[PDB]
Amino acid sequence: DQQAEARSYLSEEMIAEFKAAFDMFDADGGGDISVKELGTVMRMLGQTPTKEELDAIIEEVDEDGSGTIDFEEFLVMMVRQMKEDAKGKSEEELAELFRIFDRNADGYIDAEELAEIFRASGEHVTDEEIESLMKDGDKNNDGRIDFDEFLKMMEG
Ligand SMILES: [Ca+2]
Ligand SMILES: [Ca+2]
Ligand SMILES: [Ca+2]
Ligand SMILES: [Ca+2]
Ligand SMILES: [Ca+2]
Secondary structure, eight states: OOOHHHHHSSHHHHHHHHHHHHHOOOOOOOSEEEEHHHHHHHHHHHHOOHHHHHHHHHHHOOOOOSSSSEEHHHHHHHHHHHHHHHHHHHHHHHHHHHHHHHHOOOOBBBBHHHHHHHHHTOOOOHHHHHHHHHHHOSOOOOSBBBBHHHHHHOOO
C-alpha cells in the first residue's frame, strides 16, 4: 500500500532516476541494499553510523522483513524524503515572507508595513484594499497581523 502510493507520486522519469541511484547503491548488483552497502554510502556522506543505526534506517522501510531494502522500499524511502523537503522549503518561504513584511520586526505586520511591501513589489493597491486585507487577517481584532494569522491568510 505504501509502495503503491509512492509509485503513484512519481513519474516514470523520476522512478528511472531513482533506479539509477538504487543501482549505484546496490554495490554487488544483487537487487537489494544491505547494511554494508548502506553504510558505505553514509560513511561517504561523512557520517559514522553503527550497524544498529543502519539496521534502524532499514526498518523504517523494510516491509517484507528481509533486513535489506529493495527497489519498491527504496522509492517509499525517497518519496518520504521528497515530501519532507517540499514541506520544509514551503515553510521557509512562509517564515521569510513574514520576515520581509515585518520591517520593524516586532513580530507583527501592520497596515503600513503591509502597504510598503506591496508598494515595494511594484503593485498598485488602494487604501480600501489594504483595509479589506487587514480586516480579513485580523482574527483577534487588535489591528495587527501575527504569524498565526499570516499563515491562515497565506495557505487560506
Ligand atoms: Ca512520463
Ligand atoms: Ca546488494
Ligand atoms: Ca526488504
Ligand atoms: Ca512589524
Ligand atoms: Ca491580530
